[PDB]
Amino acid sequence: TKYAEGTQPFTVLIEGNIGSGKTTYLNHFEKYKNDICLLTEPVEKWRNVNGVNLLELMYKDPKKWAMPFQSYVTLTMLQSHTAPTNKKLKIMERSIFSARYCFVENMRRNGSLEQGMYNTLEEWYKFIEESIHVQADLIIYLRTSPEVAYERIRQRARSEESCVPLKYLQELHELHEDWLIHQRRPQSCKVLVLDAD
Ligand X SMILES: O=c1[nH]c(=O)n([C@@H]2O[C@H](COP(=O)(O)O)[C@@H](O)[C@H]2O)cc1F
Note the residues at the interface with ligand X (CB under 6 A).
18, 41, 43, 55, 73, 94, 98-99, 103, 161
Distance between CA atoms of residues 146 and 79, nearest Å: 30
The burial of 188, by beta-carbon neighbours within 10 Å (0-12 exposed, 13-18 middle, 19 or more buried), is given as exposed
After what residues is the chain interrupted, C–N > 2.5 A? none
Active site residues: 93
Shortest distance (Å) from residue 118 CB to ligand X: 13
Residue 166 touching a copy of itself (CB under 8 A): no
Choose which of 21, 25, 26, 75 interacts with a copy of itself (CB under 8 A). 75
67 near a copy of itself, rule: CB under 8 A: yes
Question: Taking CB under 8 A as the rule, does residue 162 contact a copy of itself?
Answer: no
* Residue closer to ligand X, measured from CB, 86 or 157: 157
Binds 123: which of ligand X, a copy of itself, none (CB < 5-8 Å by kind): a copy of itself
**Helices marked H in the chain:** 22-27, 43-47, 54-60, 62-82, 96-98, 105-109, 115-131, 146-154, 166-180
Residue 194 has phi, psi (to 5 degrees) of -120, 135
State the minimum distance, in angstroms, from the CB of residue 19 to ligand X.
9
Select 70 or 95, whichever has its Cβ closest to a copy of itself. 70
Per CB under 8 A, the list member of 35, 60, 127, 163 interacting with a copy of itself is: 127
115 binds, among ligand X, a copy of itself, none (CB under 5 to 8 A by kind): a copy of itself
Q: Are 14 and 26 in contact (CB under 8 A)?
A: yes
* Backbone torsions φ then ψ of 6, nearest 5 degrees: 60, 15
Q: Are strands 89-93 and 36-39 parallel, antiparallel or unpaired?
A: parallel
Phi, psi of 136 (to 5 degrees): -150, 105
Interface with a copy of itself, residue 71, by CB under 8 A: yes
Using CB under 8 A as the binding rule, whether residue 96 contacts a copy of itself is answered as: no
Taking CB under 8 A as the rule, does residue 168 contact a copy of itself? no
